[PDB]
Write a protein that binds this DNA or RNA. Structure first.
Ligand SMILES: [Mg+2]
Ligand SMILES: [Mg+2]
Ligand SMILES: [Mg+2]
Ligand code: NA
Ligand code: NA
Ligand code: NA
Ligand SMILES: [Sr+2]
Length: 140
RNA sequence: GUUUGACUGGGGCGGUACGCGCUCGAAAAGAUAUCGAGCGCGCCCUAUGGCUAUCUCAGCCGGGGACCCGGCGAAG
Protein backbone atom coordinates (compact mmCIF):
# COMPACT_ATOMS: atom_id res chain seq x y z
CA UNK A 1 0.00 0.00 0.00
CA UNK A 2 2.79 2.38 1.01
CA UNK A 3 4.83 1.48 -2.07
CA UNK A 4 2.18 2.82 -4.44
CA UNK A 5 1.60 5.83 -2.18
CA UNK A 6 5.08 7.22 -1.58
CA UNK A 7 5.56 10.50 -3.54
CA UNK A 8 7.90 11.14 -6.44
CA UNK A 9 8.99 13.89 -8.81
CA UNK A 10 6.92 14.06 -11.97
CA UNK A 11 8.69 17.05 -13.49
CA UNK A 12 11.07 19.91 -12.77
CA UNK A 13 10.18 23.00 -14.77
CA UNK A 14 12.95 25.59 -14.96
CA UNK A 15 11.97 28.77 -16.76
CA UNK A 16 13.06 32.37 -17.15
CA UNK A 17 10.20 34.78 -17.67
CA UNK A 18 11.87 37.71 -19.38
CA UNK A 19 9.79 39.95 -21.62
CA UNK A 20 11.35 40.01 -25.09
CA UNK A 21 15.07 34.83 -25.42
CA UNK A 22 18.83 35.34 -25.46
CA UNK A 23 18.66 33.67 -22.03
CA UNK A 24 17.86 30.22 -23.45
CA UNK A 25 21.58 29.40 -23.61
CA UNK A 26 22.15 29.31 -19.83
CA UNK A 27 19.15 27.09 -19.08
CA UNK A 28 20.50 24.62 -21.60
CA UNK A 29 23.72 24.38 -19.61
CA UNK A 30 22.31 24.34 -16.07
CA UNK A 31 19.70 21.66 -16.90
CA UNK A 32 21.16 19.53 -19.67
CA UNK A 33 18.47 19.60 -22.35
CA UNK A 34 16.91 21.95 -24.92
CA UNK A 35 14.72 24.84 -23.71
CA UNK A 36 11.49 26.09 -25.29
CA UNK A 37 10.24 29.51 -26.32
CA UNK A 38 7.46 31.18 -24.36
CA UNK A 39 4.79 33.19 -26.19
CA UNK A 40 2.48 35.70 -24.52
CA UNK A 41 -1.23 36.38 -24.92
CA UNK A 42 -3.34 39.54 -24.96
CA UNK A 43 -1.97 42.96 -25.91
CA UNK A 44 -0.06 44.76 -23.16
CA UNK A 45 0.44 48.48 -22.70
CA UNK A 46 4.06 47.90 -21.67
CA UNK A 47 5.13 47.82 -25.34
CA UNK A 48 3.90 44.24 -25.46
CA UNK A 49 1.11 44.54 -28.04
CA UNK A 50 2.51 41.66 -30.10
CA UNK A 51 0.59 38.47 -29.28
CA UNK A 52 2.69 35.61 -30.57
CA UNK A 53 6.32 36.47 -29.85
CA UNK A 54 9.23 35.24 -27.68
CA UNK A 55 9.15 36.53 -24.10
CA UNK A 56 10.49 33.63 -22.05
CA UNK A 57 11.94 30.12 -22.05
CA UNK A 58 11.38 26.96 -20.01
CA UNK A 59 12.63 23.40 -19.58
CA UNK A 60 10.72 20.38 -18.30
CA UNK A 61 12.97 17.77 -16.71
CA UNK A 62 11.77 14.27 -15.80
CA UNK A 63 13.45 11.36 -14.01
CA UNK A 64 17.23 11.69 -13.60
CA UNK A 65 17.49 15.04 -15.40
CA UNK A 66 15.06 16.25 -12.73
CA UNK A 67 16.95 14.95 -9.71
CA UNK A 68 20.43 15.55 -11.11
CA UNK A 69 19.25 19.15 -11.37
CA UNK A 70 17.54 19.41 -7.99
CA UNK A 71 20.61 17.92 -6.33
CA UNK A 72 22.59 21.05 -7.17
CA UNK A 73 19.47 23.22 -7.27
CA UNK A 74 17.63 22.75 -3.97
CA UNK A 75 20.78 23.71 -2.00
CA UNK A 76 20.42 27.11 -3.68
CA UNK A 77 17.07 27.81 -2.04
CA UNK A 78 15.60 28.28 1.42
CA UNK A 79 12.37 26.30 1.20
CA UNK A 80 9.49 27.42 3.41
CA UNK A 81 6.13 25.79 4.11
CA UNK A 82 4.33 28.72 2.47
CA UNK A 83 6.23 28.11 -0.77
CA UNK A 84 4.15 24.94 -1.12
CA UNK A 85 1.10 24.30 -3.28
CA UNK A 86 -2.14 22.72 -2.03
CA UNK A 87 -1.46 19.78 -4.34
CA UNK A 88 1.95 19.12 -2.85
CA UNK A 89 4.02 21.24 -5.21
CA UNK A 90 6.56 24.00 -4.64
CA UNK A 91 8.60 26.48 -6.66
CA UNK A 92 11.52 28.75 -5.75
CA UNK A 93 13.17 31.76 -7.37
CA UNK A 94 14.97 32.14 -12.88
CA UNK A 95 12.21 29.90 -11.49
CA UNK A 96 12.33 26.27 -10.40
CA UNK A 97 9.02 24.47 -10.03
CA UNK A 98 8.84 20.93 -8.68
CA UNK A 99 5.82 18.82 -9.53
CA UNK A 100 5.41 15.96 -7.06
CA UNK A 101 2.85 13.16 -7.35
CA UNK A 102 1.96 9.55 -6.48
CA UNK A 103 2.53 6.38 -8.63
CA UNK A 104 -0.54 6.10 -10.87
CA UNK A 105 -0.73 9.77 -11.85
CA UNK A 106 -0.90 8.67 -15.51
CA UNK A 107 -4.58 7.80 -14.93
CA UNK A 108 -5.27 11.52 -15.43
CA UNK A 109 -2.72 12.05 -18.21
CA UNK A 110 -3.55 9.23 -20.64
CA UNK A 111 -5.88 9.61 -23.63
CA UNK A 112 -8.20 6.66 -23.00
CA UNK A 113 -10.48 6.38 -19.95
CA UNK A 114 -8.54 9.13 -18.24
CA UNK A 115 -9.80 10.11 -14.81
CA UNK A 116 -9.14 12.81 -12.24
CA UNK A 117 -7.05 11.64 -9.29
CA UNK A 118 -9.16 11.26 -6.10
CA UNK A 119 -8.45 13.77 -3.32
CA UNK A 120 -7.19 10.75 -1.35
CA UNK A 121 -4.47 9.84 -3.83
CA UNK A 122 -3.57 13.49 -4.35
CA UNK A 123 -0.41 14.62 -2.60
CA UNK A 124 -0.51 17.06 0.31
CA UNK A 125 1.73 19.94 1.44
CA UNK A 126 2.43 17.93 4.58
CA UNK A 127 3.24 14.68 2.76
CA UNK A 128 5.16 16.86 0.32
CA UNK A 129 7.38 18.66 2.82
CA UNK A 130 8.26 15.27 4.30
CA UNK A 131 9.30 13.42 1.13
CA UNK A 132 11.47 16.35 0.08
CA UNK A 133 12.79 17.17 3.53
CA UNK A 134 13.42 13.44 3.76
CA UNK A 135 16.10 14.12 1.14
CA UNK A 136 18.99 16.61 1.42
CA UNK A 137 17.63 19.75 3.19
CA UNK A 138 15.24 21.30 5.71
CA UNK A 139 11.64 22.59 5.67
CA UNK A 140 10.17 25.94 6.79
C1' G B 1 -43.21 69.69 -76.25
C1' U B 2 -43.05 67.43 -71.68
C1' U B 3 -41.77 65.68 -66.87
C1' U B 4 -41.58 67.16 -61.77
C1' G B 5 -43.47 59.44 -58.57
C1' A B 6 -45.49 56.62 -54.26
C1' C B 7 -46.40 56.23 -48.63
C1' U B 8 -48.95 59.74 -45.08
C1' G B 9 -54.84 59.58 -38.80
C1' G B 10 -56.40 65.43 -45.30
C1' G B 11 -52.16 68.09 -47.69
C1' G B 12 -47.26 70.69 -47.03
C1' C B 13 -43.01 70.54 -43.91
C1' G B 14 -40.49 66.40 -41.16
C1' G B 15 -39.83 61.21 -41.97
C1' U B 16 -39.14 56.20 -45.51
C1' A B 17 -42.62 51.97 -41.64
C1' C B 18 -40.24 52.53 -50.69
C1' G B 19 -35.15 46.58 -51.37
C1' C B 20 -33.29 43.36 -47.25
C1' G B 21 -31.99 40.68 -41.74
C1' C B 22 -33.07 39.71 -36.09
C1' U B 23 -36.02 40.10 -31.16
C1' C B 24 -40.74 41.70 -29.41
C1' G B 25 -45.65 43.25 -30.72
C1' A B 26 -48.02 37.86 -32.42
C1' A B 27 -52.94 35.71 -28.89
C1' A B 28 -47.73 28.13 -27.29
C1' A B 29 -48.76 24.81 -35.42
C1' G B 30 -48.66 28.39 -39.94
C1' A B 31 -50.08 33.28 -41.35
C1' U B 32 -50.86 38.41 -39.35
C1' A B 33 -51.30 45.44 -39.38
C1' U B 34 -50.28 50.72 -37.78
C1' C B 35 -45.65 57.23 -38.97
C1' G B 36 -45.74 49.91 -33.43
C1' A B 37 -41.05 48.93 -29.47
C1' G B 38 -35.46 47.62 -29.62
C1' C B 39 -31.79 47.64 -33.87
C1' G B 40 -29.16 46.31 -38.00
C1' C B 41 -27.65 45.26 -43.92
C1' G B 42 -25.79 47.72 -49.19
C1' C B 43 -19.62 44.87 -46.83
C1' C B 44 -15.23 42.87 -45.05
C1' C B 45 -11.76 38.56 -45.39
C1' U B 46 -6.46 34.49 -49.90
C1' A B 47 -7.73 33.88 -44.88
C1' U B 48 -10.97 35.96 -41.38
C1' G B 49 -11.76 30.02 -46.89
C1' G B 50 -10.72 24.30 -46.86
C1' C B 51 -8.57 19.76 -44.38
C1' U B 52 -5.59 17.42 -40.97
C1' A B 53 -2.79 16.97 -36.52
C1' U B 54 -2.39 18.62 -31.63
C1' C B 55 -5.51 20.94 -28.01
C1' U B 56 -9.41 23.47 -24.48
C1' C B 57 -11.83 28.39 -23.25
C1' A B 58 -13.88 32.85 -19.81
C1' G B 59 -13.20 33.68 -14.51
C1' C B 60 -11.39 32.53 -9.73
C1' C B 61 -7.57 30.13 -6.07
C1' G B 62 -2.61 28.39 -4.49
C1' G B 63 3.09 28.30 -5.60
C1' G B 64 7.54 31.10 -8.30
C1' G B 65 -2.15 42.49 -14.43
C1' A B 66 3.75 40.24 -18.82
C1' C B 67 5.89 34.18 -18.31
C1' C B 68 6.20 29.34 -15.62
C1' C B 69 3.58 25.10 -12.30
C1' G B 70 -0.83 23.09 -9.98
C1' G B 71 -6.16 23.00 -8.68
C1' C B 72 -11.54 24.43 -9.59
C1' G B 73 -14.16 25.44 -13.86
C1' A B 74 -20.52 22.36 -19.60
C1' A B 75 -19.08 27.09 -21.62
C1' G B 76 -20.03 32.82 -18.43
MG1 LIG C 1 -49.10 65.77 -76.11
MG1 LIG D 1 -50.64 61.73 -52.29
MG1 LIG E 1 -47.08 31.79 -34.27
NA1 NA F 1 8.54 31.65 -30.15
NA1 NA G 1 -42.17 60.14 -62.11
NA1 NA H 1 -45.41 65.54 -39.78
SR1 LIG I 1 -53.95 68.47 -39.96
Amino acid sequence: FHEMREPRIEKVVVHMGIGHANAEDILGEITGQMPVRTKAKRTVGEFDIREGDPIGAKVTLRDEMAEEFLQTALPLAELATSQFDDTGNFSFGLDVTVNLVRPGYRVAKRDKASRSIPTKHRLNPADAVAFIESTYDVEV
